[PDB]
UniProtKB/Swiss-Prot annotation:
Region ranges (Required for interaction with SEPTIN4 isoform ARTS. Required XIAP-mediated ubiquitination and apoptosis): 49-64
Post-translational modification as stated in the protein's UniProt record: In the absence of growth factors, BCL2 appears to be phosphorylated by other protein kinases such as ERKs and stress-activated kinases. Dephosphorylated by protein phosphatase 2A (PP2A).
Role according to the record: Suppresses apoptosis in a variety of cell systems including factor-dependent lymphohematopoietic and neural cells. Regulates cell death by controlling the mitochondrial membrane permeability. Appears to function in a feedback loop system with caspases. Inhibits caspase activity either by preventing the release of cytochrome c from the mitochondria and/or by binding to the apoptosis-activating factor (APAF-1). Also acts as an inhibitor of autophagy: interacts with BECN1 and AMBRA1 during non-starvation conditions and inhibits their autophagy function.
Nucleotide-binding keyword on record: no
GO CC terms of this entry: BAD-BCL-2 complex; cytoplasm; cytosol; endoplasmic reticulum; endoplasmic reticulum membrane; membrane; mitochondrial outer membrane; mitochondrion
Organism: Homo sapiens
UniProt tissue specificity: Expressed in a variety of tissues.
Result, substituting residue 147 to L: Partial loss of BAX-binding and 50% decrease in anti-apoptotic activity. No effect on homodimerization
Name this polypeptide is given: Apoptosis regulator Bcl-2
Outcome after substituting residue 102 to E: Loss of BAX-binding and of anti-apoptotic activity. No effect on homodimerization
InterPro entries: Apop_reg_Bcl2 (IPR013278), Bcl-2-like_sf (IPR036834), Bcl-2_BH1-3 (IPR046371), Bcl-2_fam (IPR026298), Bcl2-like (IPR002475), Bcl2/BclX (IPR004725), Bcl2_BH1_motif_CS (IPR020717), Bcl2_BH2_motif_CS (IPR020726)
Keyword match Phosphoprotein: yes
Length: 164
């Protein structure tokens, strides 16, 4: 019914990478794309379990396979003039066969691997372009399916705990 209640698409993608990257400690902060983080007011109650879950599913799933994705990142080259194109291919195959929650969570973890790889090879700035590209596809093609499957509310409930 149209309505309105965005879930911070830009914050959802950046948040995921912020955590997956934090594992190393390398202070990213997106990239001078935010003076401070006070503007946000203590409210919403619509993205407290969706993130926790989405962030969990990635590990619970990515760890389940441990065969592709992570190591699969070796295929792609390594540079700002590479991730761009390759990104399209990698993602293309991700949802090549219909889109689904589990498939989405996989798309996230993937982007996180490519990013960390940049800062590893002295390509920190590359991590910025990554988070961006991902965000795009997220709202571009994923948006349609997102609401189709039930929207964030569907995600949170799907991979969300049991009253916690």
């Amino acid at each position: 019914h149209a309505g309105r209640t965005g879930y911070d698409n830009r914050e959802i993608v950046m948040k995921y990478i912020h955590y997956k990257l934090s594992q190393r400690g390398y202070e990213w902060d997106a990239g001078d794309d935010v003076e401070e983080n006070r503007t946000e007011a203590p409210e919403g109650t619509e993205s407290e379990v969706v993130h926790l879950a989405l962030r969990q599913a990635g590990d619970d799933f990515s760890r389940r396979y441990r065969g592709d994705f992570a190591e699969m990142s070796s295929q792609l080259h390594l540079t700002p003039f590479t991730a761009r194109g390759r990104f399209a291919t990698v993602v293309e195959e991700l949802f090549r066969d219909g889109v689904n929650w589990g498939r989405i969570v996989a798309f996230f973890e993937f982007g996180g691997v490519m990013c960390v790889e940049s800062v590893n090879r002295e390509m920190s700035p590359l991590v910025d372009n990554i988070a961006l590209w991902m965000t795009e596809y997220l709202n571009r093609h994923l948006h349609t399916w997102i609401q189709d499957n039930g929207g964030w509310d569907a995600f949170v409930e799907l991979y969300g705990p049991s009253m916690r």
